[PDB]
Amino acid sequence: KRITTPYMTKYERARVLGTRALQIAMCAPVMVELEGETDPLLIAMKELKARKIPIIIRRYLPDGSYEDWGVDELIISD
Amino acid sequence: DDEEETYRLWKIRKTIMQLCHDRGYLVTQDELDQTLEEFKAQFGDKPSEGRPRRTDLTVLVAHNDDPTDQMFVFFPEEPKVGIKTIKVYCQRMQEENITRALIVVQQGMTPSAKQSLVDMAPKYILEQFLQQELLINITEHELVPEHVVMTKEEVTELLARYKLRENQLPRIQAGDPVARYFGIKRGQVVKIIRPSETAGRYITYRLVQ
Amino acid sequence: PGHINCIRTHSTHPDDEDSGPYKHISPGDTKVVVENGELIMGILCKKSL
Amino acid sequence: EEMASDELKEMRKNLTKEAIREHQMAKTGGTQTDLFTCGKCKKKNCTYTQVTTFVVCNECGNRWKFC
Amino acid sequence: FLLGQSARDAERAKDILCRLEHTTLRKVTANTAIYYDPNPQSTVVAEDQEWVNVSPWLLRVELDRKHMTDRKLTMEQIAEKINAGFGDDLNCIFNDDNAEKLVLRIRIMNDDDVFLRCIESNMLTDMTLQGIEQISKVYMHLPQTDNKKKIIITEDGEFKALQEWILETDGVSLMRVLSEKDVDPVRTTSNDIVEIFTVLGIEAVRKALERELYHVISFDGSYVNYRHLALLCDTMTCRGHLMAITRHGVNRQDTGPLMKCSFEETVDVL
Amino acid sequence: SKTYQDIQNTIKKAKQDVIEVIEKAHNNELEPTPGNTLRQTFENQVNRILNDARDKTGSSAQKSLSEYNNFKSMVVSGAKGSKINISQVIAVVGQQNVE
C-alpha cells in the first residue's frame, strides 16, 4: 500500500552512491564483477547501474508512517 | 437624499438576497435579480418619511432542506444602535423556533452591544453587517474566488485521506468579510477554487480558527 | 551533438520578411533553422546560443 | 444653470469642456506602425519605441520587446 | 473601471471623476473677507442681493467660477451642506447663478469675534463639498496596453480588445468607491495589500499581492517562474493574517525558539 | 562625413524647436497639458523633443555604418554593447538627467 513515487530522487541516488562507496572503501564485499577498476565511487556507480545495492530506503511520511523501498525495486533516474 | 437612499436600500436588498441564495436558503429567481423599477412600484419610493421605511422591508427566508430553519434581516433606524433594540428584537424572536438572524446597522454598533450579541450566541446566533458593506457583493469580485462551505462528513474524509490533522490546515479568522458573508464559524473548513495558470484548477482548503 | 531540431531568429532579422515572399529563403541569412543537429540557415547569435 | 443667460451658459459650457480636457492624461508617446503583429489580439496596429525596441499594441495592447 | 456608458464617452466620465475626487471650499473659494456690517440691509459693500432676501457681522466668502464649473457644482447644495453641517445656527444667503461675482453671506444668530475666524478656518481646511476623503485628486488616462483594456468575447469568437476610460486616484478608499454607481465592482482593484484584507478577504489579498509582485518583477523585462511567487504568497497568507517577513511577523509563528534567534532578536526570543 | 552633416542639421533643428517652445512659453501661448502644470508640460515637451532628436541622430549613425565595422558586429552579436552605445560614441551623447 505504498503511495510514494516509484522513481528514485536525485538526493536519494547521491546518498546511496556515497554510502555504498564509503562501505567499499572500508573493505566490504562488492555485488558485481570488477573490470579492472579501483575507485570505490565508480564501483558504486557500476553497482547502481547493475541494481545490486544491499540498501533499502525508508521514506518517512509527514504523518509519521514510513515506507521501505529497495534500490533493486524502484526505477533509477540516471 | 431621497433617490440615493432608495438606490442604497435596493442595492442592500439585492445583496441580502444574493447572500441568502449563496448560503443555501431558497429564494425567488425574481427577487434574486430584480431591477429597481419594481422596487419603486412595490414600496413607494419615498424613504424620506414615507412608505419605504426601515423594519418594514425585512424578509424571512427558510433553508432548502430544512424548512424549519429561518433567519430574519432587521433594519434598525437608530444610527448608533444600542442594546435595548437588539434586546427587543431577540425577545420578539423568541416566540418562533428560529435561531439565526442578520442585523443591518446604519453605523458601527456600540461596543456594549457586541458583548450582548456574543452572550446569546449559543442560543440565538446573530451577526451584524454595516450598510456600507452591503452596497457591493464581494463574492462576484475578480480577486475573490468561488467559495464552497463544506460539510463535516467530507471534511473528515479529507482529513483522513491525506492523513493530515485539521490543525495543520491553513487558518482563516472569522473576521474575514467572506467568512461573515457565508456565516462560517469556528471549527469549519471552506473550499477554495482559484484559476491556476500553471495547472488549470487548484483547490485548497482553509480551516476557520 | 545528436539530432537537435529548433528554430530561432537572428538579431538583424527584418520583421517584414515572414509575411512576404522569401520566407524560407532569407536574403539576409536569418531565420535560424536546425534539422537533425545540422545548421541550415541563419546566423548564430545570443538569441540562439 | 438652465435659467442662466446665453453668454453665461456658453461660458459655463466652455469652462466645463476645458476642465474635462484638462482632467485627462497624456497618451503614451511612440512610433505607431502596422509592421508588428500583436500576439494578444492578432491585429497589426501598434506602437514601437527604441531604447532594445519595445512593442506596444495599438488595439489589443500586447506588450513585448525585441533585442 | 467605469461600468455604465461612461466608459466610452468622457463627458459622462468627468462627473464620475469629480464625485470621486475630494473637493473642499479651499479648492473653490478665491477670497474670504469678514466685515462688521451693523445693519443687514445697510450692506457696506455694493451688492444687490440682500434686500431681496429680506448680527453685526458677516463673512463675504466669494467663490471662483472656473473651479466651480470644472467640478460642476451649484450654490444650492453648497448652502445646504454649510447649513446642515453646522446645525441650524447660521444663515447662509447664497447668490443667484446670473451675477458675475459668486459672493456669499454667512451670518450667525442665536469671544464672539474669534468664533467667525475659527469657523471659517475649520470649514475652509476641510468641508467635503463633493467627494470622499483620502482621495486627493483623480486622473483620466486611456489604456494603451492590454493590462487595462476591456476584454469581451465577441459573437464571432475574437476577443477584440476595447478601449474604455479608466481612472487613477492618489489615495486608498476602495470601500467607498465600489459602492458608487457607474463603477465596475468586479475589476476595480486597490493596489494596496492591507486595505483589501478589510474589504474582500485573505484570498483576494493573496491574489492582489501575487499580481503586484509579478508587475514589479516583470517591469524591467526580467522573468521569474510563477511557482516561486505562489510559494511566497502562500507562506505570507498561511496563518490567515498577513504575517510580515520582518522580525514582527515571523517570530510570532510557533516555529521554535532556536529558529527565531537565528534571524534577529536572539536574546529576546531565547 | 555626410552623417556628420545630418547630425548637425538635426541638432540645429532641435535647438530651433526648443527655442521656439521657450518663446511660446514666455509669451503665454503654450497651454497646460492635461494632468500637468505649465512647467511640467514645458519640461515634458522639451524632453520629448530632445529624445526624438537623439533617436534620429542614432538611427542616422547606425544606417551609415559598414558591414566591416566592429562596433556594429559586436552589437548585433550581442556579446558586449548596444545600439545606444554606438549612438553616444558617434552621433551624440544625450541628456544628462539627475534624479
Added chain:
Amino acid sequence: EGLIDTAVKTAETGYIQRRLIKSMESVMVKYDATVRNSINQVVQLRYGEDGLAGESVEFQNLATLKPSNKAFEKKFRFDYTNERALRRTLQEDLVKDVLSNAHIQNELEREFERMREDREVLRVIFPTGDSKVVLPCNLLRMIWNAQKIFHINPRLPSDLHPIKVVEGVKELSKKLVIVNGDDPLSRQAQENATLLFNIHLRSTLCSRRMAEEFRLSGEAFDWLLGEIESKFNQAIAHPGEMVGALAA
C-alpha cells in the same frame, strides 16, 4: 548619480534577500507529494499548484485558445464527409473504415465536443487571450523529432487511424498521474492538477491535425507517446527539494 544608486542598491538588496531567505527556510516537499514547513503545516497540496520542478518547464502556445469560431471548426473537427480529403491524407484501407463505421464518427464527435469544452474552460481561466503558457513537455518539438527520425515525409498518405490517436491520448491521460489514489477526492484532485497539460495535449494531438500537418505513422505515434510519458515523469518535482530557498 549612477554610482550612488549602485552603492545604495548593494546595501539594500542584501538585507532584502536575507529577510526573504529567512522566512521560507524550512519549506520543503515531503514524500507525501505536498509542500509543508517545519511545523508540518500544509502550505500547498502540490508544489506550484501542479507538483512539477521548475527546471523542466518551457514556454509553449495554446492552439485552441483565441481562434475564431469558424476557424476552430475547420481545424479540430476532422470532417468525415469529404472522401477526397481522406484519400489524400489517410490511405485507402482507412477511408472506407472511417466512412462506413459510425462508432468512429461518434467517437470523433465526442472528441470535438470535449475539445470545445476545453476551449471554453481555457477562455474562462485565461482571460485577455494569452497563448504563451509554460508546460513540461514541448509537444511540437517532440512531433518534429519524430518526423525527422521516422522520415514521415509529409506528402504521402500516412497510416494512422484516428481511433488509434484517440485511444492513445486517453491512455496517456490515464498514465500521467499526480494524485495517486482511486478515491473520488483523489481522482478529482488529479483531474484538477493535470488539467492544463491534458488540454494542451488534446489540442495538439487531434484527428485532423495529426493527418494534415504531422502525418505521423503508428510507430511514430507510439514513440511520441512513450517520449511524452517519460519526459513528464522526469519533470515531476522530486520530494525533499528545498523549494523555499529556491524561491527566495
Added chain:
Amino acid sequence: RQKLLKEQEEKRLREKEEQKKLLEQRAQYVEKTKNILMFT
C-alpha cells in the same frame, strides 16, 4: 434524430421542474407576506 428529440423533452421536463419550484415559492410567499405584515 430520436436522440435529439428525447434530449429536447428532457429539457422540457427540466423546465416543468422550474415551474414547480416557482409555484412552491409563491405558495410559501403567500404565507410569508403575512409575517412580513405583522412584523410591522
